Amino acid sequence: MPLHHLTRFPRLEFIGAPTPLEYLPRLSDYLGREIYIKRDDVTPIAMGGNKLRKLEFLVADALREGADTLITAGAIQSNHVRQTAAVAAKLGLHCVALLENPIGTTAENYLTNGNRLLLDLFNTQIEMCDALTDPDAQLQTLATRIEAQGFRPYVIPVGGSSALGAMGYVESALEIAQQCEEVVGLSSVVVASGSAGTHAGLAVGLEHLMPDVELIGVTVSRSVAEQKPKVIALQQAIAGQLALTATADIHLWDDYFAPGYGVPNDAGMEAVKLLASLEGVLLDPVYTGKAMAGLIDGISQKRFNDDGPILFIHTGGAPALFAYHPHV
Amino acid sequence: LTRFPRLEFIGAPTPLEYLPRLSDYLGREIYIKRDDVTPIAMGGNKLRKLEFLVADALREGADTLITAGAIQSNHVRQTAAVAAKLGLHCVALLENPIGTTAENYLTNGNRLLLDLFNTQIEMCDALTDPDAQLQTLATRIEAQGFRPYVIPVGGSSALGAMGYVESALEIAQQCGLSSVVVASGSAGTHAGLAVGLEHLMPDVELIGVTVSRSVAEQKPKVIALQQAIAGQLALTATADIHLWDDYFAPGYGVPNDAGMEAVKLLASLEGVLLDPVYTGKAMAGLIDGISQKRFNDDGPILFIHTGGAPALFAYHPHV
Numbered sequence: 001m002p003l004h005h006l007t008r009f010p011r012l013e014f015i016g017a018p019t020p021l022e023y024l025p026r027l028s029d030y031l032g033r034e035i036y037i038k039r040d041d042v043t044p045i046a047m048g049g050n051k052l053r054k055l056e057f058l059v060a061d062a063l064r065e066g067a068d069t070l071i072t073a074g075a076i077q078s079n080h081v082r083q084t085a086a087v088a089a090k091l092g093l094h095c096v097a098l099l100e101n102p103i104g105t106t107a108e109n110y111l112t113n114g115n116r117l118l119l120d121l122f123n124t125q126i127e128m129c130d131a132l133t134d135p136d137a138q139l140q141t142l143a144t145r146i147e148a149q150g151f152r153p154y155v156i157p158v159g160g161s162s163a164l165g166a167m168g169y170v171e172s173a174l175e176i177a178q179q180c181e182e183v184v185g186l187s188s189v190v191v192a193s194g195s196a197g198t199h200a201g202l203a204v205g206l207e208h209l210m211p212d213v214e215l216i217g218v219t220v221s222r223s224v225a226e227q228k229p230k231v232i233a234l235q236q237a238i239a240g241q242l243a244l245t246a247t248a249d250i251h252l253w254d255d256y257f258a259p260g261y262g263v264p265n266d267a268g269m270e271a272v273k274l275l276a277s278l279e280g281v282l283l284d285p286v287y288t289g290k291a292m293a294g295l296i297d298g299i300s301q302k303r304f305n306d307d308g309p310i311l312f313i314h315t316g317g318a319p320a321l322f323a324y325h326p327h328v
Numbered sequence: 329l330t331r332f333p334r335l336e337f338i339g340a341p342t343p344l345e346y347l348p349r350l351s352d353y354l355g356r357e358i359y360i361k362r363d364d365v366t367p368i369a370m371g372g373n374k375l376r377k378l379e380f381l382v383a384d385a386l387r388e389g390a391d392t393l394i395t396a397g398a399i400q401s402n403h404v405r406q407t408a409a410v411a412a413k414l415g416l417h418c419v420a421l422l423e424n425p426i427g428t429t430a431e432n433y434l435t436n437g438n439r440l441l442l443d444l445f446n447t448q449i450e451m452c453d454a455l456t457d458p459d460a461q462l463q464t465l466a467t468r469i470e471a472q473g474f475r476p477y478v479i480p481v482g483g484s485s486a487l488g489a490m491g492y493v494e495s496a497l498e499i500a501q502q503c504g505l506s507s508v509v510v511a512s513g514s515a516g517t518h519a520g521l522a523v524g525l526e527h528l529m530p531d532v533e534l535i536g537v538t539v540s541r542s543v544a545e546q547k548p549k550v551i552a553l554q555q556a557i558a559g560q561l562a563l564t565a566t567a568d569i570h571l572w573d574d575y576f577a578p579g580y581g582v583p584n585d586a587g588m589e590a591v592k593l594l595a596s597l598e599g600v601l602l603d604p605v606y607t608g609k610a611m612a613g614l615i616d617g618i619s620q621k622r623f624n625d626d627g628p629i630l631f632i633h634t635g636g637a638p639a640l641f642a643y644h645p646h647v
C-alpha cells in the first residue's frame with residue numbers, strides 16, 4: 001500500500017519478471033554468515049545492470065515529451081552509458097554520450113574494449129571531454145548544440161540518478177520484500193553508492209517495506225561527507241514525489257574505494273576472485289568488487305547491526321572486466 | 329523428460345521477444361528466443377545442457393568436471409562457472425583453432441573468465457579426437473586423486489541435448505510461426521530442438537546454420553543425435569534435418585563480414601548482442617535466407633540466440 005503513488009509514473013517494460021534473489025551457500029560458508037544476492041546484473045538488455053530500472057521511467061518520460069534523442073555522460077567504461085545507448089538503439093532513439101577518461105589511462109582495452117566497444121555497436125554518437133567538471137552544465141551545452149540540428153533531446157543525468165530515475169529502485173525494493181517474504185529475515189542490505197539513485201531509491205522503498213533492515217551504501221567515488229548529502233537529497237525528493245516521509249538515516253562506508261573512482265584496488269580484486277571462484281558470479285573492479293570488499297570487511301570488523309543475513313545488490317558491471325584486463 | 333535428474337541453473341523460461349525494428353528493416357516478422365540471458369556467468373545455451381550433465385556427474389560422486397573447446401569456447405566458460413558454483417574442480421582442454429597470437433583472443437573474453445573461475449588449463453595442439461583425448465586426460469586426472477566426470481564438446485550428448493528439448497517446450501508455450509533458425513555446431517542444440525519441435529510444432533521448419541562444417545559433414549551428426557534423444561524419450565523422430573552451410577567461411581572461430589554485419593545490425597536496431605563465432609553467422613544465414621527466398625514461406629521467423637557475446641571482447645580489435 002504505502003508505495004502506491006508509484007503507479008502514477010509512466011514506465012516502459014525493459015525488465016519483465018523480477019530478477020533472481022539467490023542464496024550464496026559457498027560464500028556464506030567461507031564468510032560465516034548467511035549471504036543472499038539480488039541479481040540485477042541479469043536484467044535482459046545488453047549485458048544488464050541497475051540502470052535498466054531507472055531507464056524504464058526516464059525513457060517513458062522522454063517519449064511522453066516527444067524527445068527523439070537521449071543524451072547522457074559518464075566515464076569511457078560507464079555501464080550507465082552502455083545501458084542508455086542500448087535502450088536508445090532498441091527504441092530507434094538517437095543517443096549522444098559525453099565521455100571522459102577519469103583515470104588518465106592510455107591502456108588500449110580501457111580506451112576501446114568493454115563497454116566502449118558496445119557503444120559503437122549501438123551507433124552512439126560519442127563526444128569526448130577533458131573532464132566532467134560540471135556534468136549538468138556540460139550536458140546542457142551539448143543538448144543545445146543537438147537541439148540546433150533539429151533533434152528533440154532528453155538529457156539523462158550521470159547514472160540516471162534523478163528522483164524519477166530512482167523510482168526504479170523503489171520498485172526493486174518491492175520485489176525484494178516479496179521475494180524475502182516467509183523465505184528469509186534480512187538484517188542488512190549492501191549496495192555500491194555512486195551517483196546515488198540506487199541507494200536513495202532502495203532507502204525509500206526499504207524504509208517503507210522493511211523498516212528494521214539496515215541499508216549500507218559502500219561508496220565507489222567519494223567520502224561519506226561528500227556522498228551523504230547527495231543520497232539524502234534524492235531520498236527526500238523521491239519521498240516527496242510519492243507523498244511519503246523518509247526519516248531513515250542514510251548509512252555509508254567510504255573505506256573501500258581508494259585510490260579513486262575507476263581505480264581497481266586489491267580488496268576489490270580479491271572480492272571479484274572470491275565471488276567468481278566460490279559462486280561463479282562475476283563482479284567488476286569499479287563498483288561491485290569494491291562494494292563486496294566492503295561487505296566482507298564489514299563482517300570481519302563486525303560493522304553491521306547484527307549477525308543476521310545480508311543481501312548484496314548486484315548492480316552489474318562485468319563487461320568492465322574485459323576493459324580493465326590486463327591492466328590500466 | 330521429467331525422469332532424468334537435473335539441476336536448476338535457469339529457472340523461469342527465458343524471454344521470447346518480437347524484434348520490431350529488425351522486422352521493419354527486413355520486411356518480415358522476426359522473434360528471438362533469448363537463451364543468451366540465462367543467469368550464470370554471462371549466459372548461453374550450454375547451461376541448459378549442464379542441468380542434466382552435472383546432475384549426472386554428482387550422481388556418480390564426481391568432484392571434477394572435464395571438458396574441451398577452443399580458447400574462446402562459451403561451453404568451457406559455462407562449464408567452469410557451474411563447477412565453481414558447485415565447488416567442483418574444473419579441467420579445460422583448450423586448442424587455438426585459428427592460429428592467432430592476438431592478445432585479446434589469447435587472454436581476454438571467455439579465457440579471462442576461466443582464470444577467474446580457477447579452471448585448470450591444459451593446452452593441446454588440436455582437438456583431433458576430442459572424445460578420446462578427453463578420455464585420456466580424465467584418466468591422468470583420476471591418477472592425481474580426483475574423481476572426474478567428462479563433459480563432451482559443446483556438451484552435445486543425448487543426455488546433454490535434453491536441455492534443448494526443454495527449450496522447445498518453452499518455445500511452444502510462448503508461441504503464426506513459419507521458421508526457426510539456430511546455429512548448428514556440436515549439434516545438441518539443433519538435435520534437441522529438432523526432437524522437441526517435431527512433436528510440439530510440427531508445421532515449423534527448423535534451419536541449422538552451420539558454424540564449423542559442410543552440410544555433408546554435419547547432417548549425419550545431427551541425425552544420429554536426433555535419433556538417440558528420441559529413443560531415450562521413447563519418441564519417434566522422422567523429421568528431415570535442414571542445414572545451410574554457406575555462412576561460416578573460412579572456418580570455425582573465424583569471423584566473416586556477413587557475421588560482423590549481422591552483429592552490428594542486431595546491436596543497432598534492437599540493442600541485442602550476437603557474437604562473431606556462432607550467432608552472428610547464424611543471423612547472417614537468416615538474413616540471406618530472406619535475400620534468397622530460401623525459407624518455405626514468407627511467414628514469421630524465430631531466431632534462437634544461444635549466447636556467445638563475451639567473445640566480442642576477445643576478438644576485438646582483430647585476430
Ligand SMILES: Cc1ncc(COP(=O)(O)O)c(CN)c1O
Nearest residue numbers: 079159194195196198315316317
Ligand atoms: C555496476 C554498477 N553498480 C553500481 C553503480 C552505482 O549506482 P548509482 O549510480 O545508482 O549509485 C553503477 C553506476 N553506473 C554501476 O554501473
Ligand SMILES: Cc1ncc(COP(=O)(O)O)c(CN)c1O
Nearest residue numbers: 482513514515517606634635636
Ligand atoms: C553462443 C553459441 N551458439 C551456439 C552454439 C552451438 O550450439 P551446439 O554446440 O549445441 O550446436 C554454441 C556452442 N558452444 C555457442 O556457444
